[PDB]
Design an enzyme around this catalytic site. Structure first.
Site, PDB file in Angstrom:
ATOM      1  N   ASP A 120     -12.021  42.492  39.937  1.00 55.92           N
ATOM      2  CA  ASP A 120     -10.899  42.099  39.313  1.00 55.92           C
ATOM      3  C   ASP A 120     -10.142  43.122  38.843  1.00 55.92           C
ATOM      4  O   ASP A 120      -9.846  43.511  37.745  1.00 55.92           O
ATOM      5  CB  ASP A 120     -11.202  41.110  38.006  1.00 55.92           C
ATOM      6  CG  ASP A 120     -10.028  40.618  37.175  1.00 55.92           C
ATOM      7  OD1 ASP A 120      -8.927  40.115  37.782  1.00 55.92           O
ATOM      8  OD2 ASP A 120     -10.085  40.712  36.023  1.00 55.92           O
ATOM      9  N   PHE A 180     -13.442  39.736  24.336  1.00 56.12           N
ATOM     10  CA  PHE A 180     -14.699  39.306  23.653  1.00 56.12           C
ATOM     11  C   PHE A 180     -15.070  39.582  22.237  1.00 56.12           C
ATOM     12  O   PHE A 180     -16.386  39.637  21.943  1.00 56.12           O
ATOM     13  CB  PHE A 180     -15.939  39.351  24.917  1.00 56.12           C
ATOM     14  CG  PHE A 180     -15.308  38.699  26.212  1.00 56.12           C
ATOM     15  CD1 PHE A 180     -14.865  37.129  26.091  1.00 56.12           C
ATOM     16  CD2 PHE A 180     -15.830  39.077  27.261  1.00 56.12           C
ATOM     17  CE1 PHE A 180     -14.505  36.676  27.158  1.00 56.12           C
ATOM     18  CE2 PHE A 180     -15.312  38.402  28.654  1.00 56.12           C
ATOM     19  CZ  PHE A 180     -14.783  37.069  28.488  1.00 56.12           C
ATOM     20  N   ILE A 220     -10.691  50.560  17.129  1.00 56.99           N
ATOM     21  CA  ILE A 220      -9.638  50.825  18.053  1.00 56.99           C
ATOM     22  C   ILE A 220      -8.655  49.504  18.009  1.00 56.99           C
ATOM     23  O   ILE A 220      -7.476  49.791  17.847  1.00 56.99           O
ATOM     24  CB  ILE A 220     -10.242  51.375  19.156  1.00 56.99           C
ATOM     25  CG1 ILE A 220     -10.566  52.835  19.233  1.00 56.99           C
ATOM     26  CG2 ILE A 220      -9.551  50.986  20.337  1.00 56.99           C
ATOM     27  CD1 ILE A 220     -11.607  53.283  20.354  1.00 56.99           C
ATOM     28  N   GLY A 221      -9.070  48.724  18.220  1.00 54.91           N
ATOM     29  CA  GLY A 221      -8.325  47.371  18.528  1.00 54.91           C
ATOM     30  C   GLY A 221      -9.160  45.952  18.735  1.00 54.91           C
ATOM     31  O   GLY A 221     -10.554  46.005  18.352  1.00 54.91           O
ATOM     32  N   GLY A 256     -10.319  43.426  21.708  1.00 50.47           N
ATOM     33  CA  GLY A 256     -10.596  43.047  22.993  1.00 50.47           C
ATOM     34  C   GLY A 256     -10.642  41.620  23.126  1.00 50.47           C
ATOM     35  O   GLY A 256     -10.342  40.904  22.299  1.00 50.47           O
TER      36      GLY A 256
HETATM   37  C1  LIG Z   1      -7.354  47.487  21.869  1.00 47.11           C
HETATM   38  O1  LIG Z   1      -6.544  48.118  21.414  1.00 47.11           O
HETATM   39  C2  LIG Z   1      -6.355  49.422  21.448  1.00 47.11           C
HETATM   40  C3  LIG Z   1      -5.247  50.004  20.911  1.00 47.11           C
HETATM   41  C4  LIG Z   1      -5.032  51.460  20.775  1.00 47.11           C
HETATM   42  C5  LIG Z   1      -5.994  52.169  21.726  1.00 47.11           C
HETATM   43  C6  LIG Z   1      -5.745  53.595  21.903  1.00 47.11           C
HETATM   44  C7  LIG Z   1      -6.605  54.389  22.635  1.00 47.11           C
HETATM   45  C8  LIG Z   1      -7.679  53.657  23.229  1.00 47.11           C
HETATM   46  C9  LIG Z   1      -7.800  52.493  23.381  1.00 47.11           C
HETATM   47  N1  LIG Z   1      -8.824  52.048  24.162  1.00 47.11           N
HETATM   48  C10 LIG Z   1     -10.216  52.475  24.425  1.00 47.11           C
HETATM   49  C11 LIG Z   1     -10.876  51.787  25.155  1.00 47.11           C
HETATM   50  N2  LIG Z   1     -11.954  51.934  25.999  1.00 47.11           N
HETATM   51  C12 LIG Z   1     -12.391  53.110  25.990  1.00 47.11           C
HETATM   52  N3  LIG Z   1     -13.533  53.315  26.786  1.00 47.11           N
HETATM   53  O2  LIG Z   1     -12.085  54.128  25.498  1.00 47.11           O
HETATM   54  C13 LIG Z   1      -9.848  50.682  25.439  1.00 47.11           C
HETATM   55  C14 LIG Z   1     -10.299  49.623  26.339  1.00 47.11           C
HETATM   56  N4  LIG Z   1      -9.013  48.669  26.566  1.00 47.11           N
HETATM   57  O3  LIG Z   1     -11.167  49.242  27.005  1.00 47.11           O
HETATM   58  N5  LIG Z   1      -8.692  50.703  24.781  1.00 47.11           N
HETATM   59  C15 LIG Z   1      -6.964  51.607  22.409  1.00 47.11           C
HETATM   60  C16 LIG Z   1      -7.264  50.260  22.103  1.00 47.11           C
END
Ligand SMILES: COc1ccc2cccc(-n3cc(NC(N)=O)c(C(N)=O)n3)c2c1
Ligand SMILES: COc1ccc2cccc(-n3cc(NC(N)=O)c(C(N)=O)n3)c2c1
Length: 264
Positions: free
Chosen positions: A128, A20, A15-16, A18
């Site tokens: 936070d 950590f 996905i990307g 974070g």
């Molecule tokens: C980290 O980079 C990305 C880039 C695109 C994304 C597209 C969809 C969802 C993302 N995404 C999904 C996450 N967590 C979750 N529980 O679904 C997070 C987060 N910041 O916690 N970011 C994405 C995260």
């Protein structure tokens, strides 16, 4: 049980990145599609975190990102979350700027407020709360996430009030001065989050260093009204920013006040 076996997880797509480590889209065996966050060793007190799992796993609300469990067989450990298809609220506001109706922005504040009123009733302090910590899911629903996480964060520059990276922009005066956390200090952060939503993801106090934010707030400065916030919305924002935590409305009070404004 909160312990998830590595054989119960499949990583499907990165996905990307974070703070950590890495975030992956994956599947959780016989359950659901998930977001899996890999945590770098030394980033958090894993032992203190694990200890609170039994109690903390019971928190569940439609406006809170569900943390399904922890994969801890081998280092680095994994946190398994509910998948939120639209990512974090801060990036979402920024990319969709100019396409938001005032009612949608208020609805986003309402989603967060409802999630926070559940945490407040459960006596759980976020510590936070910011748009960066909120996630966008199915049909623009906003969910609160990472509540209580700063209690496990091992970087003293982020956790200490005198720390170089302390998130002062969302801190109430008793938090920035004495680390005096309560649902009332979360209310102050909620006000800043409301400003972030109504400003379509602008950074609060962009033109100021940490000590400058502290000086401005202590001397009565407050964030300017965003163009999209009605005067009634801005009044609620200012109520969150009262110097004394006792004078701030509770999340249960804010929820009724914000719903009355939304429903007219
Ligand atoms: C980290 O980079 C990305 C880039 C695109 C994304 C597209 C969809 C969802 C993302 N995404 C999904 C996450 N967590 C979750 N529980 O679904 C997070 C987060 N910041 O916690 N970011 C994405 C995260
Ligand atoms: C599951 O293990 C834990 C252990 C300690 C915790 C301490 C603070 C908060 C926790 N925590 C964080 C959660 N969700 C999230 N998106 O961050 C949940 C939940 N029930 O959905 N519990 C914790 C969850």
């Amino acid at each position: 049980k909160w312990v998830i076996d590595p054989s119960e997880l499949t990583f499907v797509q990165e996905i990307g990145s974070g703070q950590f480590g890495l975030v992956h889209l994956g599947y959780w065996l016989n359950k659901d599609k998930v977001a899996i966050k890999t945590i770098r060793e030394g980033a958090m007190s894993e032992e203190d975190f694990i200890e609170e799992a039994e109690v903390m796993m019971k928190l569940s609300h439609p406006k809170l990102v569900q943390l399904y469990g922890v994969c801890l067989e081998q280092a680095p450990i994994c946190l398994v979350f509910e998948f939120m298809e639209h990512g974090c609220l801060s990036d979402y506001l920024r990319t969709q700027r100019g396409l938001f109706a005032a009612e949608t922005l208020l609805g986003m504040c309402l989603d967060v407020c409802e999630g926070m009123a559940y945490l407040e009733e459960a006596c759980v302090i976020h510590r936070d709360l910011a748009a960066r910590n909120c996630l966008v899911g199915e049909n623009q629903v906003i969910k609160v996430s990472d509540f209580g996480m700063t209690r496990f964060v091992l970087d003293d520059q982020y956790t200490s009030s005198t720390g170089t990276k302390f998130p002062v922009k969302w801190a109430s005066p008793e938090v920035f001065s004495f680390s005096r956390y309560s649902s009332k200090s979360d209310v102050w952060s909620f006000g800043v989050l409301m400003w972030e939503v109504f400003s379509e993801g602008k950074i609060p106090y962009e033109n100021r260093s940490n000590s400058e934010v502290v000086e401005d707030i202590s001397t009565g400065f407050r964030l300017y009204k965003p163009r999209l916030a009605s005067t009634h919305v801005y009044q609620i924002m200012n109520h969150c920013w009262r110097e004394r935590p006792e004078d701030r409305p509770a999340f249960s009070r804010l929820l009724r006040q914000l719903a009355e404004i939304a429903e007219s």
